[PDB]
């Protein structure tokens with residue numbers, strides 16, 4: 017109930033659902049760290065453009 | 070209104086250089102990728118150069134490629150073209166034309182660029198003095 021109450025004043029993100037275009041490799045130095053646990057390729061870091069009203 | 074004024078052009082000789090300055094007013098020049106065009110005696114229009122909103126990329130005709138270099142100045146709200154190795158065939162009136170308004174239109178909805186930039190790649194709506 018308190019979580020819903022704190023959720024109420026938050027602004028909605030419904031218009032964000034439009035289709036976007038993202039790029040995985042970006043202008044940064046490190047992409048493969050010292051450790052590899054099937055997560056270096058799954059970097060979960062992309063930079064993405066999106067239309068907003 | 071949105072006005073553009075060219076200057077710096079004058080009589081020159083081949084092999085030298087030239088600085089054509091296109092000042093602008095009446096709008097936010099910080100993101101308006103301008104277009105340098107030329108018109109020779111007894112000839113039609115001929116596109117010279119084009120620069121993006123941010124100056125990242127730029128396009129020059131293969132004939133005029135290398136001889137001219139285009140640049141922008143958002144602080145001055147000005148555009149600049151520096152020549153090099155001028156040729157007698159370059160005799161022309163040079164104009165500085167704007168891009169297709171601020172946003173790009175589609176289905177009555179207008180899109181501005183990143184950081185709300187005035188971008189397009191379309192016809193040239195406004196033309197300068199020359």
Ligand SMILES: *[C@@H]1O[C@H](CO)[C@@H](O[C@@H]2O[C@H](CO)[C@@H](O[C@@H]3O[C@H](CO[C@H]4O[C@H](CO)[C@@H](O)[C@H](O)[C@@H]4O[C@@H]4O[C@H](CO)[C@@H](O[C@@H]5O[C@H](CO)[C@H](O)[C@H](O)[C@H]5O)[C@H](O)[C@H]4NC(C)=O)[C@@H](O)[C@H](O)[C@@H]3O)[C@H](O)[C@H]2NC(C)=O)[C@H](O)[C@H]1NC(C)=O
Pocket residue numbers: 039041042043126127128129130131134135
């Ligand atoms: C995420 O990864 C992606 C995948 O790599 C990134 O995207 C792009 O991928 C491409 C895959 O093929 C990469 O291609 C490589 O590009 C190499 C560099 O080529 C340029 O530089 C060499 C010199 O090192 C040059 O010989 C090449 O021709 C090219 O530059 C030339 O530059 C001149 C001068 O600026 C251009 O001349 C233009 O001429 C016209 C008139 O005709 C106007 O006057 C212009 O003003 C003028 O500039 C010339 O046109 C241009 N050449 C070409 C063909 O356009 C190359 O050596 C490799 O073999 C390979 O082809 C590409 O580099 C890569 N993008 C980047 C930015 O690296 C993606 O970018 C990345 N994500 C992020 C965020 O970066």
Ligand SMILES: *[C@@H]1O[C@H](CO[C@@H]2O[C@@H](C)[C@@H](O)[C@@H](O)[C@@H]2O)[C@@H](O[C@@H]2O[C@H](CO)[C@@H](O[C@@H]3O[C@H](CO)[C@@H](O)[C@H](O)[C@@H]3O)[C@H](O)[C@H]2NC(C)=O)[C@H](O)[C@H]1NC(C)=O
Pocket residue numbers: 037038039042043063064065122123124125183
């Ligand atoms: C993913 O990111 C690239 C690179 O963007 C650059 O690096 C990021 C980490 C951020 O720091 C960005 O702020 C930064 O621009 C996007 O590609 C484009 O790269 C060019 C590099 O030549 C950027 O050019 C800049 O343009 C400004 C304004 O015109 C100039 O003042 C600068 O001097 C420089 O030339 C360009 O801005 C950048 N594009 C964008 C939209 O930021 C790539 O587009 C992006 N991926 C997606 C999907 O947008």
Ligand SMILES: *[C@@H]1O[C@H](CO)[C@@H](O)[C@H](O)[C@H]1NC(C)=O
Pocket residue numbers: 044045
């Ligand atoms: C990455 O950082 C190293 C130093 O830690 C430096 O030598 C190298 O040039 C950097 N590479 C890039 C692409 O920034």
Ligand SMILES: *[C@@H]1O[C@H](CO)[C@@H](O)[C@H](O)[C@H]1NC(C)=O
Pocket residue numbers: 050051052053
């Ligand atoms: C990285 O991968 C190799 C083989 O895929 C594995 O032997 C090694 O343990 C991995 N690195 C780590 C930190 O587990």
